[PDB]
C-alpha cells in the first residue's frame, strides 16, 4: 500500500527535503541509498515510500517540479539530494512571476503534460496505488497555479484512490507578498472541489510553537519544515508498522468527513518539550491528552474555543494500554460537553500503533475538523474584497487572459465555504 | 539571468564607470577582465552571469554599451584605467554634442547614430539564453540624454517588445541648477519616459549632497561619491539575481509588486547604512535600527517629503547576515507607526527579500565595512509634488517664449510643447486621483 | 607650506574626504579591516527537542 | 595560515565498483565544506557547516568521512595549496636502537605532536653493511616520515632522548634502507605463543597509536613484530571471515579496515591471548564507559564499528592471523 | 532597567561631566568605554544596563545627550579626557547663546535646535525595552536652561506621555547671586515647570558652599566639589535600579509614596556622612548617628529651615553594611522628637530603603572612604517660603518693568510675566492651604 508524493514551489519542495530526511532516518536508509539499519520491522514495509534500485541503493517515490530551477539545485545539492531519480525532476526556463494566472495557463500548460507522463509511469508501476501526497503553498505562484492544475489532472485519472493535500496559508501578521489574497482565493476555490482530505497550516503558528513552546532563541525556516515533516510522516504511521488498533487514509477519511465539502483539518503533535523542561516531566496518555487538545500545540491561528468540535482523530504511536485511551477519551468529552456537536454520540476515533519515533518513549498525532476555520477564510476573503473593488492589480492577470468573472465566481465558492460551516456551528438538534 | 546595460550620455557613463568598478571588484574581474592565475579551481561559477561574459581563453567581458554624441567621455574610458575591460565596438561615440537641445539629440544627429547602438544591442542578445530586462542610466536635463535616450527606448519597445526596461534617471534639483533650459528638456524626456518604461526611479543631486553631508563628515562632495553611492543602490538590487538567498525576488516581480496601475510606475529609492568608519565604532546596527532609518526622511536619495502623502507598495530589500523573523518584527513595527501611513485599498504593502552576501567595501571609498544592509524601492503620491515644480518653471518660460526658436530651427513644431505640458498635467491628475479613498457609506 | 598642525585646525578639509574633529587628530588612526555591527546568535535546532 | 584549501579526491562506489572523482574545497574562516563534480562539472554540495574536520586532517594521502563517504585525498587542485605544501614531500627516516624500545610510543607520539606524518613503519633487523655505514644497532626500529620544517623539529629528539635515536637526511642512505629495511623478504615474527593488536585507520588518523603502544609497554607485554599495511577489500573480508553472521556491523567493519592503512602489532606475554582481550575491552564502548572505565577502547572508542583496537578472540587463530599479516602481506 | 540623561546648558553639562565620571568610575568602564584588560570571558552581569549599552566589538557608550546653544562647554567635552566615551551625534552645539533671555531660548534660538534633540531623544528611546524615566539636569537662573528646558520639556510630556521624568535643577540662592535677571527667569521657568514635571529636587549653591565649609575642612570651594557631591547624590539615588539590595524601590515608588496631590512635587535632598579623610579614621559612622544627622539642617543641600513646618512623606536610602532592625530603630528614635513634625493626615510618615553597594571614592576627591551612608529627600511645606522670596524680589523689579524691554523686543508679551505671577501665587496658597488642620471639624 505505497503513496506517492508530489512536491510543487519552493515551500512545497523545502518541506519535502525534510521529510525525505526524517522518513530515510526512521527506515535506516543512509544517504548513499544504502540499508544501514537496525531491526527488521523497518525493511519489512519500506515499498510503502520507496524503490528498489539495483544492489543496495533505495529510490524515493517523488515527482519534483518547479519553474525555475534555483530551488530543485538547491535540494539535488543538498546533503541527502543524490538519493532523488534524476529524471523525476522538472523544471522550466522561467518563473511564475507571483502570478497564479501565468502559472496555471501559460507555462502550466507547457510543463504539466511531462509531469503527468512521470506521474503515470510512477503509479502503474505499483501493485496497488494508495492515494497521493502533495506538498505546496496557496498564496505563490507555482505552488498555487500548477498545484492546482496538477491535482485537478490526477483526480481526473484516479477517482477511486485517495487524494491527500498539505497547503500552507498566506497570514495577515507577517505576510511575504502583495497579492496573496487572489492567489489563496483561486486556489481554494480548486482546492474544495478536487480534494478529498486537506490539512492547513499557518507559519504564524509555527513561530508561536518554536518561541512560546520550545523557547527557541532563534527558530529557522528548517524547523517549521521540520515539525511540518513530523506531523506529516505521522499520519502514515499505521500504514507501515504493526499495532494493536491498525487504520488507515481511507478509515480516517470514513470516520472524520461527515458531508463532502467539510474536509478542511487542523494538525498537531504533542510531545513537544523544550530541553532544559524534559528532565521534569514524564511522558503518559493524560499528559499526551492535555498537550494534544490545548490550542497552544495546534498549527492554525483559529483557536478551538471560538468553534465546536464536529470530528477528531488520534493516532497514538507506543506500548500502552488502551483502557487508559478510550477512558481519557471519554472523560475528554464528558468534561467539555458544549464544545462536541450534540447529535453525534461518539466524536473521536482512536488508534493505537506499537512502534513509536526514534528518540521518544512515546508520540500522538492530531487531526481536528472544526467550524473555527472559518475565520482564517474569512479574514482572506476580507482582503480580497479591499483589493478587488479597487481593480487593485488586476492588469497583469487580465492580461495573462482571465475573465474578472472567476473572481466572483471564486468569491463565491469561498463564501458558500464559510456560510456552510458557520451553519452548523450555530444550530440545534429540533 | 542576463541583464543588458545601455549608458547614455555624461551622467550615465560616468555612473557606469562605478557601477562597472563595483561589479568587477564583487565578482573578483581583474581591471583587465581576466581572474587570478592562481585562485583557478578547474570548474567555475556562474555568478558572474548576469553582468559577464567569457571569452573561450577565460577572459570577462561586460554585457554593456557606452553612447555619447561627444567623444571626450569615452575617449576617458578608452584611455583609462579600464582599456582592456570593455569591447572596443560597444564604445561608441559621435563627433559633436547635442547643445542642451532635446530637438537636436532626437531629430538631427541621434538619428545617424541610433542604427549602431540598435546593432550592438541586436549582437548582444543573439548571445544570450534568459535575457530579463534592460538597465538604462542618463540624465533628463541635457540634449543627448533626453533626446537620444527617448528616441532609443522607443526603438528598443518596438523591436524587443515584453522584455522590461528599467531606467535610473537623474532629474533636475529643486533649486540647485545647471543649464537655464532643464525644464524643457525635462518635460520633453518626461512625456516619452511615461509611455516606454516600467519603472522609474528618481534622483536628486540636492538630496545626496545633504545625505552626504549629515551622515558622512564630507564638507566638500564630488560626483564620484554620489556615482559610488547610485552603484551601490544597483549592485544591491541585482544581487537578488546573482546570490543564494532565503527569499529571492525576481526583476518580474518587483513590477509585479510595485505597479498597480500601468501608469504610476514612478518609485523612490534609499539606503541605509551610509555611515562613516569614526561613527561605526561607537554603534552597534541591528535589524530594526536600519529598517526604522530607512523610513526617516534624513535618508532619502530624492527631494520630496513623504509625509505629505500616502504610501501604496513598499519593496524591502535585505542583504547580509539577516534573520526573516527580524525582517518580519521591523516591518510589524514600522506598520505600527502613526506617521507612517499606506493607502486602505493595499493592506498588504510589503515584499520582503533577503540574500546572504554582504555588501563590498571598495578602496577608495568612504562608507565603513557593515555585515547587513536594507535598500528600499517604494511608490508614494509625494512624487507628484516634484512634477509640479518642473511644470511652473515651464510655465514661467514658455509664457514669453524665453528660448523656443532654438528647438523651432532644430526642427520641432511649438505644438510638440504644449502636449506634453498636457501629458504631465495629467500624470498630475492621475496621481490626484489614485490616492483618493471612496464607498465610506456602506 | 601650510603646517600640519594648522592644516589640523582649517576650517575647510580637502575635496571629497571625511574629516576628523580636532580634538581627535592626535589620537591613533582607525581601523578599516574591521566589519562593524553585531553577530546574531544562532544556535541548537528543533531536532534535538523533536528527536533526544 | 590559509582562506580557502582545494583538494581533488577519490571515491570507491561498493554498488557500482568504479572510482569516482570530486573536487573539495575548504573555507578555514568559518569551518564549511564545498564539493564540486570534475566529470560533470556541477555542484555536488553546498557550503554547509561541518565541524568534525579540521586543517590540520588535510593533507595528501589522508582519509576523511563526509556524509558516511569515505574520501581519499589524492592531489592538489589549486596552486595556491601546492605553493603552501611545497615543503612536506621529502621523506626522512629516523631509527630507534636497542636502547630506545622501551620509550618508542613516546617518540611516535612527540613525532606526531609536531606535525609529522608517518608514511612507513617497520620492527627490523638490518644487514650489517649498513648497520655499520650508518651507525645503528642490529635490531632497530624504521620510521619513514614527511612534513614541514622536518629536520629542525626532529633536532629535539637528542635531548629529549639521549643516545636511543638516529636521524638520515641523505637521499642516497634514504634510498638504501627504503630497499634494505622495508620491502619483501623475512619477519621477525613468532608462530606460537603469540597475540595480534590491530590499529584501525580511523585511529591512525587521529594519532592514539603512540599512546596505544606505550600503554602495552607499561602493562609488561613485549612487541615480538610491528609494521603498517593497506587493506583491499578482500583482503579486509578474508581478515574477518570468522566475524560474518555473528556481530550485526560486519560490512561497516569491512569498509573501514578498507579505508585506509592499519598498523599490526604483536603480543607476546603469559596466556597471551586473553592478557590482550582483557586489557582491551569489550567490543561496544558503551559497556567500557560505565563499568570498565580504564580500558583502550573506552578512551579510543566511539561504537562498535570504530572501537579503537582490534585483538584476537579464539585462541586457535592467533598464528593464523599472525602469518596473515606478517608473511602474506609482507612477502608479497 | 533603563534611564535616559538629558544635560541642558552650562550648570547642566558641568555636573553631568562628574556624574559620568563616577557612574564610569564605579562600575569599571575605563573612560575610553572598555572593560577591565585582566578578564577573558564574555559579560556576566547586567548592572552597567541601567545606563551603557554595549557595542558588539563590546565597547560601552553611555545613554545621554549633551544639548547647548554655545559651543565652548560641549567642546571642552569633546577635547577632554572622555572624548572616546561619548558618541559625537549625542554631543549638540549651535552657534550662539540665550544671553541670559528666556525669550531668546524658547521663541527664537532654540526652536532651531529643538528637532535635533527630539530626533536624537527617539533614537535613544527606540534602543530600550523597559524604559522607565527621564533625569533631566539644568538652572533655572540662565537663559537657556529656562527656554530651552521648558520647550524640550513641553514636546518630551507631548511626545512619550506617561514616562516619568524626574529634574535636578540648580535654583537661585537667596542671597547669593550671579545675574541681574535672575529673578524674571526663575519665575517664567517655575511657571512652565509647574505643569511639566514630575518630581523636582531643590538645590541652593549657598548651602552646598556651607556644607563643604562646616563638615568639609575645604576654605576655598569651586563648581568641581559642588558637582563631585551632587554626582554622589545622583548615585545613591538611581543605586536601587543597580544593585542587590534587602528593599529596592523602583522610580514609580517614589512617585506613588512622596506626591499627595499632583500639584505637591517639590522636594528637600540632603546628605549625612559628609566627612573629611582625617575625622574618618577616628570615628565609626553607626546607622543611628548618620540617621540623626540628615535631619539637621547643618546636613541639607538646600537653603531652608525645616522648622517652619511640617513634614508629608519621607524616603530614606540607606547603602552599604545596614540592617534592617537598626534602620527601623533609627525611625523610631526620629518619631520620637519633638522639633519633628508630620501633618496629622500622614502618620506612617517614612520609606526606607537598603542596598549593599558602599559609596565610591574618587582618585582626586575629597570625601573620605566610608562603610555606609544614608540619603534623605522628603517632601515638606517649609519650600513655600523660598517661592515667597522669589516673588517678593520679582514684584519690585516688576513694579515698574525695569528690563522688560529686551524681553518684549525678542517675542514676548508683557502679559505672561503677570499670568506666571499669578499662578505661582496659587502655588503658594496651595501650601497655606494643604497645611491646614482639618480635624478641627468635628
Ligand atoms: N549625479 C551626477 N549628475 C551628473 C553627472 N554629470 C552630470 N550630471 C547632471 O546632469 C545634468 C547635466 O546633464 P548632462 O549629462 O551633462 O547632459 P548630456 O547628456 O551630456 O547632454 P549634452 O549636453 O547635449 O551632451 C546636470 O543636472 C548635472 O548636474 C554625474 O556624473 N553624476
Ligand atoms: N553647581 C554648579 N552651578 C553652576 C555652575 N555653573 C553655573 N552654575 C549656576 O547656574 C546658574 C547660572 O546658569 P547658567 O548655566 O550659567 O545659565 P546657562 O545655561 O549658561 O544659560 P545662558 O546664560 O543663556 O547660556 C547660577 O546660579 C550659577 O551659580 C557649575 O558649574 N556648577
Ligand atoms: N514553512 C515554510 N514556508 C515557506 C518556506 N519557503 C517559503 N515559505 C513561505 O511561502 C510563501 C512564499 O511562497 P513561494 O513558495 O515562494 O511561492 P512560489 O513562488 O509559487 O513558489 C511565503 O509566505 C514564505 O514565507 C519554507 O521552507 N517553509
Ligand atoms: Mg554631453
Ligand atoms: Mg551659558
Same mark, same amino acid.
Given at each position: 500500500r505505497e503513496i506517492v508524493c508530489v512536491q510543487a514551489g519552493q515551500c512545497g519542495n523545502q518541506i519535502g527535503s525534510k521529510f525525505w530526511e526524517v522518513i530515510s532516518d526512521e527506515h535506516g536508509v543512509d544517504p548513499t541509498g544504502t540499508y544501514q539499519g537496525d531491526s527488521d520491522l523497518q525493511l519489512e514495509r519500506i515499498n510503502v515510500y520507496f524503490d528498489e534500485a539495483t544492489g543496495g541503493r533505495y529510490v524515493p517515490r517523488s515527482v519534483l517540479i518547479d519553474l525555475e530551477p534555483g530551488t530543485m539545485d538547491s535540494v539535488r545539492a543538498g546533503p541527502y539530494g543524490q538519493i532523488f531519480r534524476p529524471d523525476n525532476f522538472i523544471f522550466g526556463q522561467s518563473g511564475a512571476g507571483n502570478n497564479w494566472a501565468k502559472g496555471h495557463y501559460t507555462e502550466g500548460a507547457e510543463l504539466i503534460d511531462s509531469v503527468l507522463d512521470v506521474c503515470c509511469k510512477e503509479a502503474e508501476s505499483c501493485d496497488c496505488l494508495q492515494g497521493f501526497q502533495i506538498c505546496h503553498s496557496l498564496g505563490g505562484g507555482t505552488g498555487s497555479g500548477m498545484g492546482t492544475l496538477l491535482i485537478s489532472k490526477l483526480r481526473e485519472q484516479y477517482p477511486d484512490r485517495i487524494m491527500m493535500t498539505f497547503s500552507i496559508i498566506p497570514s495577515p501578521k507577517v505576510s511575504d507578498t502583495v497579492v496573496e489574497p487572489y492567489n489563496t482565493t483561486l486556489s481554494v476555490h480548486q482546492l474544495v472541489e478536487n480534494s478529498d482530505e486537506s490539512m492547513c497550516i499557518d507559519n504564524e503558528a509555527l513561530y508561536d510553537i518554536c518561541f512560546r513552546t520550545l523557547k527557541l532563541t532563534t527558530p529557522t525556516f528548517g524547523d517549521l519544515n521540520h515539525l511540518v515533516s513530523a506531523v506529516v510522516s505521522g499520519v502514515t504511521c499505521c500504514l507501515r508498522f504493526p499495532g494493536q488498533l491498525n487504520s488507515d487514509l481511507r478509515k480516517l477519511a470514513v470516520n472524520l468527513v461527515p458531508f463532502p465539502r467539510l474536509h478542511f483539518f487542523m494538525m498537531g503533535f504533542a510531545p513537544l518539550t523544550s530541553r532544559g523542561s524534559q528532565q521534569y516531566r514524564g511522558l503518559s496518555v493524560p499528559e499526551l491528552t492535555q498537550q494534544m487538545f490545548d490550542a497552544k500545540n495546534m498549527m492554525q491561528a483559529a483557536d478551538p474555543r471560538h468553534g465546536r468540535y464536529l470530528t477528531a482523530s488520534a493516532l497514538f504511536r507506543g506500548r500502552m494500554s488502551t483502557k487508559e485511551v478510550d477512558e481519557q477519551m471519554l472523560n475528554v468529552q464528558n468534561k467539555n460537553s458544549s464544545y462536541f456537536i450534540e447529535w453525534i454520540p461518539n466524536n473521536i476515533k482512536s488508534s493505537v500503533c506499537d512502534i513509536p519515533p526514534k528518540g521518544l518513549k512515546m508520540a500522538v498525532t492530531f487531526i481536528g475538523n472544526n467550524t473555527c476555520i472559518q475565520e482564517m477564510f474569512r479574514r482572506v476573503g476580507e482582503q480580497f474584497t479591499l483589493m478587488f473593488r479597487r481593480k487593485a492589480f488586476l492588469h497583469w492577470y487580465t492580461g495573462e487572459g482571465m475573465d474578472e468573472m472567476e473572481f466572483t465566481e471564486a468569491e463565491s465558492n469561498m463564501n458558500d465555504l464559510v456560510s456552510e460551516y458557520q451553519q452548523y456551528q450555530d444550530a440545534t438538534i429540533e | 539571468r542576463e541583464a543588458i546595460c545601455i549608458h547614455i550620455g555624461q551622467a550615465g557613463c560616468q555612473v557606469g564607470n562605478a557601477c562597472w568598478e563595483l561589479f568587477c571588484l564583487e565578482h573578483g574581474i581583474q581591471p583587465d577582465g581576466a581572474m587570478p592565475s592562481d585562485k583557478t579551481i578547474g570548474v567555475e561559477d556562474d555568478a558572474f552571469n548576469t553582468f559577464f561574459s567569457e571569452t573561450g581563453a577565460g577572459k570577462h567581458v561586460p554585457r554593456a554599451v557606452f553612447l555619447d554624441l561627444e567623444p571626450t567621455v569615452v575617449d576617458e574610458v578608452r584611455t583609462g584605467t579600464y582599456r582592456q575591460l570593455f569591447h572596443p565596438e560597444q564604445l561608441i561615440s559621435g563627433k559633436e554634442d547635442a547643445a542642451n537641445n532635446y530637438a537636436r539629440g532626437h531629430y538631427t544627429i541621434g538619428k545617424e547614430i541610433v542604427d549602431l547602438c540598435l546593432d550592438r544591442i541586436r549582437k548582444l542578445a543573439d548571445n544570450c539564453t534568459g535575457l530579463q530586462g534592460f538597465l538604462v542610466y542618463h540624465a533628463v536635463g541635457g540634449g543627448t540624454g533626453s533626446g537620444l535616450g527617448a528616441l532609443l527606448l522607443e526603438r528598443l519597445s518596438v523591436d524587443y517588445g515584453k522584455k522590461s526596461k528599467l531606467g535610473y534617471t537623474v532629474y533636475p534639483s529643486p533649486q540647485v541648477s545647471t543649464a537655464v533650459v532643464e525644464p524643457y528638456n525635462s518635460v520633453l524626456s518626461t512625456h516619452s519616459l511615461l509611455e516606454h518604461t516600467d519603472v522609474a526611479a528618481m534622483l536628486d543631486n540636492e538630496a545626496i549632497y545633504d545625505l552626504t553631508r549629515r551622515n558622512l563628515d564630507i564638507e566638500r562632495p564630488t560626483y564620484t561619491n554620489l556615482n559610488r553611492l547610485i552603484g551601490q543602490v544597483v549592485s544591491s538590487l541585482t544581487a537578488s539575481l546573482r546570490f543564494d538567498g532565503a527569499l529571492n525576488v525576481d526583476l518580474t516581480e518587483f513590477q509585479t509588486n510595485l505597479v498597480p496601475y500601468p501608469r504610476i510606475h514612478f518609485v523612490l529609492t534609499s539606503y541605509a547604512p551610509v555611515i562613516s568608519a569614526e561613527k561605526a565604532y561607537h554603534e552597534q546596527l541591528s535589524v530594526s535600527e536600519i529598517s526604522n532609518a530607512v523610513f526617516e526622511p534624513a535618508s532619502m536619495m530624492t527631494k520630496c517629503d513623504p509625509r505629505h502623502g500616502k504610501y501604496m507598495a513598499c519593496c524591502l530589500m535585505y542583504r547580509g547576515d539577516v534573520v526573516p523573523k527580524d525582517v518580519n518584527a521591523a516591518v510589524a513595527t514600522i506598520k505600527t507607526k502613526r506617521t507612517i501611513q499606506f493607502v486602505d485599498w493595499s493592506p498588504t504593502g510589503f515584499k520582503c527579500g533577503i540574500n546572504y552576501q554582504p555588501p563590498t567595501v571598495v578602496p577608495g571609498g568612504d562608507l565603513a565595512k557593515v555585515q547587513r544592509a536594507v535598500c528600499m524601492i517604494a511608490n508614494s503620491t509625494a512624487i507628484a509634488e516634484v512634477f509640479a515644480r518642473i511644470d511652473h518653471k515651464f510655465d514661467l518660460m514658455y509664457s514669453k517664449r524665453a528660448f523656443v526658436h532654438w528647438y523651432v530651427g532644430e !526642427?520641432? +513644431? +511649438? !505644438?510638440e510643447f504644449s502636449e506634453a505640458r498636457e501629458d504631465l498635467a495629467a500624470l498630475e491628475k492621475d496621481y490626484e486621483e489614485v490616492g483618493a479613498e471612496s464607498a465610506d457609506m456602506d | 607650506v601650510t603646517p600640519e598642525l594648522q592644516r589640523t585646525y582649517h576650517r575647510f578639509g580637502e575635496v571629497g574626504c571625511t574629516r576628523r574633529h580636532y580634538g581627535r587628530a592626535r589620537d591613533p588612526p582607525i581601523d578599516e579591516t574591521f566589519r562593524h555591527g553585531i553577530r546574531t546568535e544562532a544556535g541548537e535546532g528543533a531536532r534535538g527537542c523533536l528527536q533526544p | 595560515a590559509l582562506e580557502r584549501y582545494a583538494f581533488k579526491v577519490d571515491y570507491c562506489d561498493p554498488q557500482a565498483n568504479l572510482v569516482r572523482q570530486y573536487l573539495l574545497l575548504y573555507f578555514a574562516e568559518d569551518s564549511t565544506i564545498e564539493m564540486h563534480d570534475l566529470k560533470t562539472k556541477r555542484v555536488f554540495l553546498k557550503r554547509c557547516a561541518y565541524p568534525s574536520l579540521t586543517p590540520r586532517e588535510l593533507f595528501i594521502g589522508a582519509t576523511v568521512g563526509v556524509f558516511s563517504r569515505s574520501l581519499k585525498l589524492v592531489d592538489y587542485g589549486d596552486e595556491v595549496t601546492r605553493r603552501h605544501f611545497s615543503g612536506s614531500e621529502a621523506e626522512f627516516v629516523v631509527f630507534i636502537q636497542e636502547g630506545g624500545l622501551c620509550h618508542m610510543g613516546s617518540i611516535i607520539d612527540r613525532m606526531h605532536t609536531w606535525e609529522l606524518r608517518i608514511t612507513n613503519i617497520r620492527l627490523v633487523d638490518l644487514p650489517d653493511s649498513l648497520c655499520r655505514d650508518l651507525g645503528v644497532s642490529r635490531r632497530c626500529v624504521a620510521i619513514l616520515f614527511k612534513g614541514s620544517n622536518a629536520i629542525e623539529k626532529v633536532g629535539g629528539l637528542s635531548t629529549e632522548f639521549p643516545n636511543m635515536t638516529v636521524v638520515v637526511a641523505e637521499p642516497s642512505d634514504v634510498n638504501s634502507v627504503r630497499g634494505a629495511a622495508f620491502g619483501p623478504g623475512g619477519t621477525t615474527a613468532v608462530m606460537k605463543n603469540c597475540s595480534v593488536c590491530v590499529i584501525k585507520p580511523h585511529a591512525i588518523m587521529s594519532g592514539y597509536q603512540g599512546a596505544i603502544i606505550q600503554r602495552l609497554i607499561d602493562e609488561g607485554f613485549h612487541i615480538t613484530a610491528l609494521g603498517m599495511y593497506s587493506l583491499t577489500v578482500a583482503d579486509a573480508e578474508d581478515f574477518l571471515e570468522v566475524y560474518n553472521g555473528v556481530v550485526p556491523e560486519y560490512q561497516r567493519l569491512v569498509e573501514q579496515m578498507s579505508s585506509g592503512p592499519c598498523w599490526a602489532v604483536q603480543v607476546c606475554a603469559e596466556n597471551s591471548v586473553s592478557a590482550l582481550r582483557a586489557i582491551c575491552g569489550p567490543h561496544d564502548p558503551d559497556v567500557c564507559h560505565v563499568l570498565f572505565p580504564h580500558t583502550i577502547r573506552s578512551k579510543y572508542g566511539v561504537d562498535r564499528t570504530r572501537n579503537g583496537v582490534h585483538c584476537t578472540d579464539l585462541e586457535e587463530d592467533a598464528p593464523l592471523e599472525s602469518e596473515f599479516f606478517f608473511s602474506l602481506l609482507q612477502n608479497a
Open positions: - | !526642427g520641432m +513644431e +511649438e !505644438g | - | -
